[PDB]
Enzyme design. Structure first.
Site, PDB file in Angstrom:
ATOM      1  N   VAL A  54       0.836  -1.197   0.000  1.00  0.00           N
ATOM      2  CA  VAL A  54       0.000   0.000   0.000  1.00  0.00           C
ATOM      3  C   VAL A  54       0.874   1.251   0.000  1.00  0.00           C
ATOM      4  O   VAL A  54       1.657   1.471   0.928  1.00  0.00           O
ATOM      5  CB  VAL A  54      -0.924   0.039   1.227  1.00  0.00           C
ATOM      6  CG1 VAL A  54      -1.846   1.252   1.162  1.00  0.00           C
ATOM      7  CG2 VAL A  54      -1.722  -1.257   1.332  1.00  0.00           C
TER       8      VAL A  54
ATOM      9  N   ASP B 238     -16.248  -6.857   8.398  1.00  0.00           N
ATOM     10  CA  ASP B 238     -14.906  -6.599   8.946  1.00  0.00           C
ATOM     11  C   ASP B 238     -14.847  -5.227   9.625  1.00  0.00           C
ATOM     12  O   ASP B 238     -13.855  -4.513   9.500  1.00  0.00           O
ATOM     13  CB  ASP B 238     -13.862  -6.667   7.823  1.00  0.00           C
ATOM     14  CG  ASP B 238     -12.449  -6.939   8.331  1.00  0.00           C
ATOM     15  OD1 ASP B 238     -12.260  -7.173   9.541  1.00  0.00           O
ATOM     16  OD2 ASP B 238     -11.525  -6.987   7.489  1.00  0.00           O
TER      17      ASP B 238
HETATM   18  C1  LIG Z   1      -0.156   0.446   7.214  1.00  0.00           C
HETATM   19  O1  LIG Z   1      -1.114   1.339   7.782  1.00  0.00           O
HETATM   20  C2  LIG Z   1      -1.045   2.692   7.546  1.00  0.00           C
HETATM   21  C3  LIG Z   1      -0.139   3.480   8.267  1.00  0.00           C
HETATM   22  C4  LIG Z   1      -0.037   4.861   8.078  1.00  0.00           C
HETATM   23  C5  LIG Z   1      -0.851   5.482   7.137  1.00  0.00           C
HETATM   24  C6  LIG Z   1      -1.740   4.622   6.325  1.00  0.00           C
HETATM   25  C7  LIG Z   1      -1.914   3.276   6.626  1.00  0.00           C
HETATM   26  C8  LIG Z   1      -2.448   5.526   5.519  1.00  0.00           C
HETATM   27  C9  LIG Z   1      -3.524   5.216   4.646  1.00  0.00           C
HETATM   28  C10 LIG Z   1      -3.682   3.909   4.302  1.00  0.00           C
HETATM   29  C11 LIG Z   1      -4.734   4.057   3.357  1.00  0.00           C
HETATM   30  N1  LIG Z   1      -5.296   3.076   2.617  1.00  0.00           N
HETATM   31  C12 LIG Z   1      -6.286   3.425   1.777  1.00  0.00           C
HETATM   32  C13 LIG Z   1      -6.729   4.751   1.662  1.00  0.00           C
HETATM   33  N2  LIG Z   1      -6.187   5.747   2.383  1.00  0.00           N
HETATM   34  C14 LIG Z   1      -5.176   5.456   3.230  1.00  0.00           C
HETATM   35  N3  LIG Z   1      -4.409   6.126   4.112  1.00  0.00           N
HETATM   36  C15 LIG Z   1      -1.962   6.778   5.770  1.00  0.00           C
HETATM   37  N4  LIG Z   1      -1.021   6.763   6.727  1.00  0.00           N
HETATM   38  C16 LIG Z   1      -0.249   7.926   7.236  1.00  0.00           C
END
Ligand SMILES: COc1ccc2c(c1)c(-c1cc3nccnc3[nH]1)cn2C
Length: 271
Positions: free
Chosen positions: A29, A134
């Site tokens: 991601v 979930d």
């Molecule tokens: C792995 O988990 C994380 C850790 C930090 C994070 C994220 C996810 C995200 C984030 C994940 C994410 N996934 C989908 C849509 N918007 C998003 N924003 C933003 N930050 C700053």
């Protein structure tokens, strides 16, 4: 529709992956930009880790579920590696955010505000005849303006008839999942309501693990006796009694998501 006709399909050149936010068994991601200027989140499928069709099913479902309170599908790249591009949430996971310096300074008022926004998102899902399956603090994302949105539609389903029944070998997080869904594999909007109840404990305890200091078997056993989760520390008794409606023995006795929103909006404005 076919990719050459699909409005969500974009050329892969329009994307630039800037910062990896996460990596797991099934892919990564990233934070990136679409056409230079638009912050997006990119979920890329690890070729071979799982089925392209299974991966993309999450996107197709997000085409059907559009609302301000749900994280929005932005586009797909349907050639390997497969990308799902979504609305970027600047403050990440609710479970994580509640633990930061900013998260830590939130009034119980703002917490109820957030709780109301989540229930509002679930009310749309409830009304569209979907279930989430979930629902939990980890799957609520937080914007830079401190507003909340439902995320992770991997397990989300459309309900033709009342119930969706999972596999007999299918396993779900035991602390968040409704008893009937654990026991019989039967999920309804009402089993999401139960999860919402649990989520409320995460919000008020700032992302602490539910049922403090209890194993799953102890949790399953306490519930069968008629016990529910011990009042969390610093929990308004009103909110706790709201959690309890969510945890009613019979699914049909659990409140709607529209009721929960309205109730949470009264709690919020009254503080
Ligand atoms: C792995 O988990 C994380 C850790 C930090 C994070 C994220 C996810 C995200 C984030 C994940 C994410 N996934 C989908 C849509 N918007 C998003 N924003 C933003 N930050 C700053």
């Amino acid at each position: 529709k076919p990719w050459w006709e699909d409005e969500w399909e974009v050329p892969r050149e329009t994307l630039k992956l800037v910062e990896r936010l996460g990596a797991g068994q099934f892919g990564e991601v990233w934070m990136g930009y679409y056409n230079g200027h638009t912050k997006v989140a990119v979920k890329s499928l690890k070729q071979g880790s799982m089925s392209p069709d299974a991966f993309l099913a999450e996107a197709n479902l997000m085409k059907q579920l559009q609302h301000q309170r749900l994280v929005r599908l932005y586009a797909v790249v349907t050639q390997e590696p497969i990308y799902i591009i979504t609305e970027y949430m600047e403050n990440g996971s609710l479970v994580d955010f509640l633990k930061t310096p900013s998260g830590i300074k939130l009034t119980i008022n703002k917490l109820l505000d957030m709780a109301a926004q989540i229930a509002e998102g679930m009310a749309f899902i409830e009304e569209r005849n979907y279930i989430h399956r979930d629902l939990r603090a980890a799957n609520i994302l937080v914007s830079d303006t401190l507003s909340c949105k439902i995320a992770d539609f991997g397990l989300a389903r459309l309900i033709e008839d009342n119930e969706y029944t999972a596999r007999e070998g299918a396993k779900f997080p035991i602390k968040w999942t409704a008893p009937e869904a654990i026991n019989y594999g039967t999920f309804t909007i009402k089993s999401d309501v139960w999860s919402f109840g649990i989520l409320l404990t995460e919000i008020v305890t700032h992302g602490r693990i539910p049922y403090p200091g209890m194993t799953n078997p102890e949790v399953i056993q306490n519930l069968e006796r008629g016990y529910r989760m011990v009042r969390p520390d610093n929990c308004p008794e009103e909110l706790y009694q709201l959690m309890r409606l969510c945890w009613k023995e019979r699914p049909e006795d659990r409140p709607t998501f529209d009721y929960l929103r309205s109730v949470l909006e009264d709690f919020f404005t009254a503080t």
